[PDB]
């Protein structure tokens, strides 16, 4: 459901930059899409979407399908690509990326 909030071309540039099988980075991808500077409000709303299960948290499984809201079958993480997002979005090593953690990494991307 984040397709209406964004763009379009912004999703075609980030995915075209990481479509490879292991070329995803979390900083270059989100940096191109535009979430880096969207508005903390519409950002907490972007995360609310990343939370595919409704646990106010981004779990590793969501990280794999993190691009489903932008494309139902858009990017499909390769596993190693998921080990990058998790090791780049989790610092406390809790296995869960809350908002401040998510809106902090997405904005600093
Ligand atoms: Ca979750
Ligand atoms: Ca965390």
Curated annotation (Swiss-Prot):
Give the protein name, as stated in the record: Parvalbumin alpha
Give Gene Ontology CC terms.
cytoplasm
Q: Which InterPro entries match?
A: EF-hand-dom_pair, EF_Hand_1_Ca_BS, EF_hand_dom, Parvalbumin
**Which residues make up the binding site for Ca(2+) 1?**
51, 53, 55, 57, 59, 62
What's the further remark here? This is the major component, having an isoelectric point of 5.0.
Keyword Calcium in record: yes
| Organism from which the protein derives | Esox lucius (Northern pike)
- The EF-hand domain extends over 38-73, 77-109
Keywords attached to this Swiss-Prot or TrEMBL record, sorted alphabetically, are: Acetylation, Calcium, Metal-binding, Muscle protein, Repeat
A molecular-function term among this protein's GO annotations: calcium ion binding
Which residues does the record list as N-acetylalanine (modified residue)?
A: 2
The task this protein performs is described as: In muscle, parvalbumin is thought to be involved in relaxation after contraction. It binds two calcium ions.
Residues that hold Ca(2+) 2 according to the record: 90, 92, 94, 96, 101
Question: Which family does the UniProt entry place this protein in?
Answer: Belongs to the parvalbumin family.
């Amino acid at each position: 459901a984040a397709k209406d909030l964004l763009k379009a071309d912004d999703i075609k540039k980030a995915l075209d930059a990481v479509k490879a099988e292991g070329s995803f980075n979390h900083k270059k991808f989100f940096a191109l899409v535009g979430l880096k500077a969207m508005s903390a409000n519409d950002v907490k709303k972007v995360f609310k979407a990343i939370d595919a299960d409704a646990s106010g948290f981004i779990e590793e499984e969501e990280l794999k399908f993190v691009l489903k809201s932008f494309a139902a079958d858009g990017r499909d993480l390769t596993d190693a690509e998921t080990k990058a997002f998790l090791k780049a979005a989790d610092k406390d090593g809790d296995g869960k990326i809350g908002i401040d953690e998510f809106e902090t990494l997405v904005h600093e991307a």
